Write a protein that binds this DNA or RNA. Structure first.
Ligand SMILES: Nc1ncnc2c1ncn2[C@@H]1O[C@H](COP(=O)(O)O)[C@@H](O)[C@H]1O
Length: 638
DNA sequence: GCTGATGCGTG
DNA sequence: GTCGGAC
DNA sequence: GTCCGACTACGCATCAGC
């Protein structure tokens, strides 16, 4: 009945009864829209998971086929990552498409969306013959349609579909379609919560029951200590099957048929399906390394400054390569799929490798900085056109000749790789390693890593919790790098010359800042980076306040920002701020120290973060562009 | 055909 | 990528 | 400690306007 009252938060929820659509029907969008409201209006993850599980339990019950689209809509994805589907819609399009469904001038709506920090708000509030209600599988279909449109005049074909949806919207549905398209759904619930909410709902209301189903609450006969243990157990089955097959188009099918408990029997890590890779927790010292890893024996590997390349060789010759995000990078490495046989021993018949592809200068036999690695062509590439040579630095092995080494320790996997593959210096090399426990030979290896052009030390255990089982701990490796050590690495004192407006969590004060570095010769300040991270909320207000005085109507004439985003508020140069950063880069758009190191290009910071306010310094006292040039030169340049 | 704006995926 | 915050 | 969402530089790919 009236979907505008659907409350899946309501206590003692019943899949069939407090639904707001009768069985075998399509699930309505305002179902999802209402649910989303019930989620964004709480803050306890555990409560938010329940509200989704509910909507999910119903869907499992009355409308099985709609399930998969609901998860996706709730994840705000479009499909499996390897499909590389993308909306190609941006704020420009969407804002426009909004104005076009409502009337206001783009330049009026445009300011409301910046003043509110949320597009979805503006679409709804703006106020003919009403069309049929929207369905959830319907909106998912239109979203995919928009993704698929390409080539000239495709934006315009997109703005229609969008104008379409917005015009079949009822109550809140505007709010959430806008937000989905803008990439920023911001509910407070994401993958993990969606995953946990699914595993619950199919445990409370198991799938494949003939309607009307026997057990809508398979939980009702448990004790609270028993339920909370039961769900959590079922949770991990789902979680780890996903971490090996992070693809809902494969799972949700089998789930619906064989239920949760036997899902690991049909959904197994197989070469060709890309799995989630092992993340790295930051470790700000070496004290901290032995606090975390007090007992266990660990290895030490260089941290290469390439990108992650997940290499699949499947029984059947064919190679596929995937990125950190399960994106299909096969097209962009024809110089890898070729060199492929030259690393697998001949008795190696199917494998999965966890490596980092780094840029290699052949004519010099030395590394090339990340910036160069990124100048390779993407998408599809023919093998002749290649220009930036890449050399892999393999540091794990996850599958070999049939077996799935997830369950084996690192020490098991290391020898298994070391002994099955072949080093080629300039193509294929094991991460330079040094097993130890020795503080003095660690920092001797730390400084060494960098000396050899790397960000620092990877640090992982060898036997104790040494698996590749992402589901237990996902940041179980440790990343140890120079700029984390309070009192090391490059910190500069810089000038706040403008500020940017916030989005979402920072809606209603400044979300970013523009930072500048006194050039001496030109008696000009010069934009060097933006900065939107590393302050607390309390500091970030002290900011938006003590800067609410300095506000300018126009630039000062001695400030030169060039091709940086024009700040939304310009500022009278007073505040001086100390910034830490992991590197300095040759900026294709920043003015600071342009000329001193390159004909055209300035210099920016890599991973800028704010450390503290430098009151005792005055703007002519901050770091000079002559200074800035110096740090870039003293930075493993060869 | 080009160019500027900008989406999106690496980090 | 870095980072804080709420639970 | 986990999970989520603020924010960042760099560059290839793409398409509206011209
Ligand atoms: N020896 C290594 N071990 C682990 N990760 C590495 C190694 N070399 C490079 N990486 C990259 O470092 C990333 C982790 O860095 P971030 O996380 O702090 C991984 O996703 C890899 O892409």
């Amino acid at each position: 009945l009236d979907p505008s009252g659907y409350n899946p938060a309501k206590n003692n929820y019943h899949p069939v009864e407090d639904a707001c659509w009768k069985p075998g029907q399509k699930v309505p969008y305002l179902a999802v829209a209402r649910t989303f409201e019930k989620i964004e209006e709480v803050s306890a993850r555990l409560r938010m998971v329940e509200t989704l599980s509910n909507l999910l339990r119903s869907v499992v019950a009355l409308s099985p086929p709609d399930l998969l689209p609901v998860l996706y809509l709730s994840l705000n994805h479009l499909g499996p990552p390897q499909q590389g589907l993308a909306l190609g819609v941006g704020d420009g399009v969407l804002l426009k498409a909004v104005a076009q469904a409502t009337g206001r001038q783009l330049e009026s709506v445009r300011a409301e969306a910046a003043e509110k920090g949320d597009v979805g708000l503006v679409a709804e509030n703006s106020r003919m013959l009403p069309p049929p209600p929207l369905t959830a599988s319907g909106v998912f279909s239109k979203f995919r349609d928009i993704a698929r449109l390409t080539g000239s005049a495709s934006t315009a074909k997109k703005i229609d579909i969008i104008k379409g949806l917005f015009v079949a919207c009822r109550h809140s549905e505007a709010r959430f379609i806008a937000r989905s398209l803008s990439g920023r759904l911001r509910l407070g619930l994401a993958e993990q919560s969606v995953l946990a909410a699914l595993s619950q709902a199919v445990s409370l209301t198991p799938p494949g029951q003939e309607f009307p189903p026997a057990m809508v609450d398979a939980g009702k006969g448990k004790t609270a200590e028993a339920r909370k243990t039961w769900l959590e157990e079922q949770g991990m089955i789902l979680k780890q099957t996903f971490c090996e097959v992070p693809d809902l188009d494969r799972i949700i099918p089998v789930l619906l048929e064989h239920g949760l408990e036997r899902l690991p029997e049909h959904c197994k890590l197989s070469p060709g399906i890309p799995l989630k890779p092992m993340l790295a927790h930051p470790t700000r010292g070496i004290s901290e390394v032995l606090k975390r890893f007090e007992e266990a024996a660990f290895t030490c590997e260089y941290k290469y400054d390439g990108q992650r390349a997940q290499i699949h060789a499947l029984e059947g010759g064919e190679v596929k390569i995937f990125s950190r995000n399960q994106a299909d990078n096969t097209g962009k490495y024809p110089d890898i799929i070729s060199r492929i046989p030259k690393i697998k021993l001949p008795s190696v018949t199917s494998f999965i490798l966890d490596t980092e592809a780094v840029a290699w200068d052949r004519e010099k036999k030395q590394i090339q900085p990340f910036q160069v690695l990124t100048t390779r062509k993407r998408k599809e590439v023919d093998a002749s056109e290649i220009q930036v040579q890449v050399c892999l630095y393999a540091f794990d092995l996850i599958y070999l000749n049939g077996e799935s080494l997830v369950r084996e320790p690192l020490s098991r996997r290391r020898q298994l790789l070391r002994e099955n593959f072949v080093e080629t210096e300039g193509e294929f090399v094991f991460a330079t390693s040094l097993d130890t426990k020795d503080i003095e030979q660690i920092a001797e290896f730390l400084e060494q890593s960098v000396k050899d052009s790397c960000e620092g030390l990877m640090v992982k255990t060898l036997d104790v919790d040494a698996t590749y089982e992402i589901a237990k701990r996902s940041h179980n490796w440790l990343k140890l790098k120079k700029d984390y050590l309070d009192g090391v690495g490059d910190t500069l004192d810089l000038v706040v010359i403008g500020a940017y407006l916030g989005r979402g969590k920072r809606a209603g004060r400044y979300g970013g800042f523009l930072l500048a570095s006194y050039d001496e010769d030109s008696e000009e300040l010069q934009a060097i980076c933006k900065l939107g991270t590393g302050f607390s909320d309390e500091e970030l207000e002290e900011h938006h306040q003590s800067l609410k005085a300095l506000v300018l109507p126009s630039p000062r004439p001695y400030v030169r920002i060039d091709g940086a985003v024009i700040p939304d508020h310009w500022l009278d140069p007073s505040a001086v701020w100390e910034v830490k950063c992991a590197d300095l880069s040759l900026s294709p758009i920043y003015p600071a120290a342009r000329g001193l190191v390159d004909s055209d290009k300035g210099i920016s910071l890599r991973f800028p973060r704010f450390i503290r306010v430098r009151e005792d310094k005055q703007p002519e006292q901050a770091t000079t562009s002559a200074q800035v040039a110096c740090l870039y030169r003293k930075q493993s340049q060869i």
